[PDB]
């Protein structure tokens, strides 16, 4: 899925689009290798599925590399997901997959 990802002023897909289409992750966010199966659904349900299983580590990694704010979000606590996910190109792939 990388070799068919770039082509011509280029336009590239972030891997998050492919994860949105259904392909299951491997080692994101400092978790254990090979935790996710492909039976994770595709789209919003699949995204929620693979996020909720990691959310605590998902936020402690964010707080462990700089990303911190004084806003107790009900989901991610104090880490500022709004800046990092934009940085890590998560929103970009997630909204480019839908086009």
């Amino acid at each position: 899925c990388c070799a068919f990802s770039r082509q011509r002023g280029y336009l590239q897909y972030p891997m998050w689009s492919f994860v949105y289409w259904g392909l299951p992750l491997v080692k994101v966010f400092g978790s254990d290798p090979w935790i996710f199966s492909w039976y994770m659904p595709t789209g919003d349900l699949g995204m929620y599925s693979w996020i909720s299983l990691i959310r605590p580590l998902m936020t402690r990694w964010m707080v462990a590399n700089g990303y911190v704010t004084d806003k107790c979000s009900p989901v991610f606590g104090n880490a500022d997901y709004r800046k990092c996910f934009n940085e890590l190109k998560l929103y970009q792939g997630y909204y480019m997959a839908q086009l």
């Binding site: 959310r55 605590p56 936020t59 606590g77």
Partner: peptide
């Protein structure tokens, strides 16, 4: 590091966590 259990927010000392 000490983490909450209601919103997963992470702190750095038990009194802060409490």
């Amino acid at each position: 590091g000490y983490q909450c259990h209601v919103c997963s927010a992470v702190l750095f000392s038990p009194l802060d966590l409490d």
